[PDB]
Amino acid sequence: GAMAPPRKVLIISAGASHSVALLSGDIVCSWGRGEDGQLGHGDAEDRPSPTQLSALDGHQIVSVTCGADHTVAYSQSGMEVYSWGWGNFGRLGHGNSSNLFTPLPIKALHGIRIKQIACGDSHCLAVTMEGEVQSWGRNQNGQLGLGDTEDSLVPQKIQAFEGIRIKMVAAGAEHTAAVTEDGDLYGWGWGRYGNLGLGDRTDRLVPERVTSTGGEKMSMVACGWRHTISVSYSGALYTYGWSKYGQLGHGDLEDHLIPHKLEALSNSFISQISGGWRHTMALTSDGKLYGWGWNKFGQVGVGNNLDQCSPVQVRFPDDQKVVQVSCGWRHTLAVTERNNVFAWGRGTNGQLGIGESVDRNFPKIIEALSVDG
């Protein structure tokens, strides 16, 4: 009968038009567009405020990840991965293309110790604690890394990584990237905008190592829709791929086919990165959040609707430090050290979680999840 403590916001993730969070005390909640089943509540309604996903009550979820129009979650205790939302191309991993409006376990992953899950538009990848990788879903450009272009409705092991311990993966519209535990960087899938980092515009059906990395080992990678971001062991930030909207952050609109160091952030140590549809976010080790790219809907968070081709600091009340950031397609979410959650950008499906379905061009607090709401 003890008092229930205030819940810590542990994980935030954002998709094309939805948002999901994991809170301490074993609570998943979701909000935004629901038409495709991506919220997991058993209906197709949008939710403009965070709504508890009752089907995962008691399931001891440890992480959530959004794809464009689907969501994946996993439990370490239960050794179970769950998925729900749009089913086309096999992105949910159940052996069919059926849409799901409530979570269902990915039977093929039962009993596997999971390290990380990444979701792109229509494909997903799981990294195991041993550094093995399994992928499923859309594969028309090779993004599953299985050596062909056949969609896979169930997870399959990427045998190209046999003997290579993967640390994390990331996925965009139709490409995939990865870093190894010893700091190598890989790309595969759709290559047309240079977003694989391999120096050309050609697709790859299996992982290929990026060799121009500034001589540096890479600690993390993230994908936007058609761009890619990596951070080195020295905290330097690199971007590559499409920059039609300035999402590479180099002060122009030029694409880059190999990782290109973002020199304006050279004096900052980057600790977290995220990519949206046409925008980008990077969080420094001192809690400063920088955004850049397309800002039509205010998703950069700097109080206007002007695109930004160079990083600009996103400001929060009292300059409270940011501890986590996640880009959706046209919106952005962030958690601060005060256990507040903020959202900004496009809000017409309720994805900002602030009750009303309008756009915001600077951070707005999510009252349902925040101490200072």
Provide DSSP, 113-178.
-EEEEEE-SSEEEEEETTS-EEEEE--TTSTT-SSS---EEEEEE-GGGTT--EEEEEE-SSEEEE
DSSP alpha helix (H) spans, the chain: none
Task: For residues 70 and 83, give the distance between their C-alpha atoms in angstroms, rounded to a whole number.
Answer: 7
The method recorded for this entry reads X-ray
* CB of 75 closer than 8 Å to CB of 98: no
Task: For residues 128 and 42, give the distance between their C-alpha atoms in angstroms, rounded to a whole number.
Answer: 30
Alpha carbon of 88 to those of 27, 35, 123, 226: distances in Å? 28, 14, 10, 20
Report residue 228 CA to chain centroid gap.
Answer: 12
Task: For residues 163 and 105, give the distance between their C-alpha atoms in angstroms, rounded to a whole number.
Answer: 28
Q: Which residues contact 351 (CB under 8 A, 6 or more apart)?
A: 14, 17, 18, 19, 31, 32, 33, 328, 331, 343
* CB of 174 closer than 8 Å to CB of 141: yes
Task: For residues 255 and 252, give the distance between their C-alpha atoms in angstroms, rounded to a whole number.
Answer: 9
Task: For residues 207 and 223, give the distance between their C-alpha atoms in angstroms, rounded to a whole number.
Answer: 15
Q: Is 58 exposed, middle or buried (0-12, 13-18, 19+ CB in 10 A)?
A: exposed
Assign residue 145 a region: left if phi > 0, alpha if psi is -120 to 50, beta otherwise? left
* Amino acid identity for residue 53 in this structure: L
- Resolution of the experimental model in angstroms, please? 1.4
Task: For residues 83 and 119, give the distance between their C-alpha atoms in angstroms, rounded to a whole number.
Answer: 11
Beta bridge partners of 73: 64, 82
Quote the DSSP letter at residue 280. Answer: E
* CB of 69 closer than 8 Å to CB of 16: yes
* CB of 70 closer than 8 Å to CB of 86: yes
* CB of 206 closer than 8 Å to CB of 160: yes
Q: Which residues contact 327 (CB under 8 A, 6 or more apart)?
A: 14, 224, 274, 275, 276, 279, 280, 281, 299
Report residue 81 CA to chain centroid gap.
Answer: 17
Nearest to 291 by CA among 36, 303, 115: 303
* CA torsion, ordered 264, 266, 268, 270, to nearest 10 deg: 90
* Amino acid identity for residue 25 in this structure: G
Q: Which residues contact 57 (CB under 8 A, 6 or more apart)?
A: 26, 27
* Amino acid identity for residue 112 in this structure: I
